[PDB]
Each structure stands twice: as C-alpha cells, then as structure tokens.
Structure 1
C-alpha cells in the first residue's frame, strides 16, 4: 500500500479488500508470462533467453519443461541438466524480456549467422519417414483420417480435408505441403539421406534423392538433417526466418515437429540388436578385409 508505504501479507488483510489504485499487487505466475531461462555455463548469446511461461498445474511435476528443439540455444540435454529460471516482475524488465531477449531473437546464431534450431533426433528421422516415397508396406500413403490426425497437435489452424474422401490416399509430401503452404519458401538441395558412400549399395529411389520445395509445396525428396535439421544453414527453417521472421520459423519448427512425431505415432521406429548384426556371409567378408590389412602390416614387418 503506497499510502502507508508498507507491504502487507495477503493472509493478514482484515478489511483491506480495498485494493486501491496505486498500490502494488504481487500475483502468481500465470501462463503467458515471460521468464528468463538460463543454462550455465553461459557461453553463447542465447544461453539466456526469454520464454513464455506455461504453468504445469499437475502438482507432481517439479521440472522445467522445454521443447527439445529449444535445447540448441542452451546446449542442453535431458540427462540431468539444470537451468535457472527467473520471472521478471518489474514492468521495465518485462517489456525488455518480451521485446529484446525473446528466444525468437536468437533463432539465428550471432556467431555463425546460421539458424540455431531445427528438428533433432525423432523429428529428423520422423520427417524422413513421413516424406519418403516408399515404405516397406508399399507407397508412403495415409488415408484422410490419418492425414487429419497428423495435424491434431500442430496447434495451428488445421488445413481443409473436405475435398478428400475417406478412402482417398495422401502422400507424406502432400501433408507436409499442407503445412509449408502457410510460409511458402523455395528450397532445392540433396538430402542427407542421399550420399555417395552408400550409393554403390542400396537402391536409392529417384523421388527421394532430390529435395525440392516450390512455394511451400514439397514435390520430391525427403526431409532430413539437411533441410529440417538444427543448425542447417539454408534449410527450410532458415528460409522461413528470412522471408517471414524468426518467430514464424519457431512456429514452423514446432508444427513440422508435430507432423513428424504424429507420423511415427503410426509408423513406429525402433532399434534392435539384430540391426547391428552382420550376416554370416558379410562377417566372412569383413574378416577377409581385416586379414588383408594384417598381411599388409606383416609385409611391412618383413621389410
């Protein structure tokens, strides 16, 4: 109360319900408040960023929760890392936090001028699975119900599927284009999937080895680390930032992340011990290669 110049606890207010104009109320943090999020050591300019608070009303949760794609700002992982969080309470510090220190300002690295954020891990491999031309089940198609279900969690305005029958089939490139059309960009680059070391073996699909986007329509190629990966200069999120703003890129990273995650929700992705196992014929081939290296070492000894 500024008339008394005194601070009063909320429990001791007998008839102080006259919260009069000019006095300062200290209220709880609500969803939508901005907070400074800091991981130490603070080495980068993005080691402190301002995030919009989402209050987790579950009393059993006591962790700071963040999107996995926001970890690139702090060089953080979830193996036990701790980060400091303070909510600006002053008006000047809150205006500053919103306008200046928001993490949309650190989407492009000051150090390298490239984008910092992008898809990581599941969203990188889930974007490839979504946008690949063929699956082991045949063509990489989904029906209208599953195409709609990919956009359930994007938190954006969902596209229109009214022109699709229930039995109509949609490609993963078609549903991706439904999202990228909101921020149309032009991209043409080879994917990380296509590489010359792998090329002599494996059948590379022609539709997969050249990623092309025209006005937000992905027409060929897969989306992987080259296009959607974090720190990929010239990727789709760097382009969205250049044309529409770093805040749009952050919203597009989240939306494409949801599409990739909702796709693997049906595709499934796993690793097995048999994934690392050579066939008995290939194990003999590897043994013969090493015997060649040992003989070459042995001849050097004889010299």
Structure 2
C-alpha cells in the first residue's frame, strides 16, 4: 500500500475465517521470508489455499460473509420491488469491471437488452462449471405460512 497514511494490515473479509479475526481492533503478525528455502516452502506448503478445506472438519472454511451473502441473494433474486430483476448491457458489464478475471463478451447485446441476475452470474461460473442443487437458506418452512 503505497499510500503513506495507511498503517494497517489490510485483507479480504473472507480471509478472516482462517484466523477467526474481525476488524474491531484485532492485531496480526506478519513476517516476510528472506531466505530462499523459507521462501519456497511458504509458497508451496503454507499458502492459504491449503487451508481452504478444514483439517478439523474436512469441510470448506471460506465463502461469502454478510454483504456478498445478502448481495448474492439480491443479485440472483428473481423479482425486485421494481418488477423483474434485470439490468441493461452497461450495468451488466459494470458488475465485471472489478472481478479481475477476464471480462466476458457482451457483443451479442444491444444497449437496451436486459440481462437477468442469474444470466450475469452464469457468465462467471462458466469458468469452473459445477453441478449444484439444494434449497437456499431463503426458503424456510418457518416463514412459508
């Protein structure tokens, strides 16, 4: 961080599950390996991708927390209070201008063509095609009546 006015260690909110950390005033240690051997095993052994699956519970550790959970709901929600949950080509493109992936192709879309929220998510999930079918947390038999 080349801004001289920042003194904090900054990290993504989805990485806090590894350290059981939050941003209420927690402090964390950081050291940079200077040796070649210590530098190799940092990158090959101790990279945080190795702790994505828990050793304790064999399940995943990371995912969306609090804003990408409620924001992924709103994005893939079928109906908005304004009617159908759609966006034009410009706003569909603008969802991807930050993901740091390769941008999708929107060439087969006029400026007035509307894209569903699921259509935009499918553009991103096509890189790693998976098969999934469960009921969401949204559907609760408590709220159904």
CA distance in 2, matches of 1:77, 1:123: 16
In the TM superposition, what is the alpha-carbon distance from 1:189 to its structure 2 partner? Answer: 0.2
Deviations 1:122-177, CA, capped at 9 Å, x for gaps = 00000000000000000000000000000010000010000010000000000000
Deviations 1:174-201, CA, capped at 9 Å, x for gaps = 00000000000000000000000000xx
**Number of residue equivalences:** 144
In the TM superposition, what is the alpha-carbon distance from 1:102 to its structure 2 partner? Answer: 0.1
CA distance in 2, matches of 1:65, 1:192: 30
> What is the match of residue 88 of structure 1?
33
> What is the match of residue 58 of structure 2?
113
The structure where helix makes up a greater share of residues is 1
> What is the match of residue 122 of structure 1?
67
Match of 2:115 among 147, 163, 170: 170
CA distance in 2, matches of 1:112, 1:173: 31
Greater radius of gyration (CA): 1
The structure where strand makes up a greater share of residues is 1
SS in 1 for 2:90: helix
Question: Where has structure 1 moved over 6 Å in runs of 4 or more?
Answer: none
Normalised to the residue count of structure 1, the TM-score between the two structures is 0.47
- Output the aligned Cα RMSD: 0.3
CA distance in 2, matches of 1:171, 1:115: 29
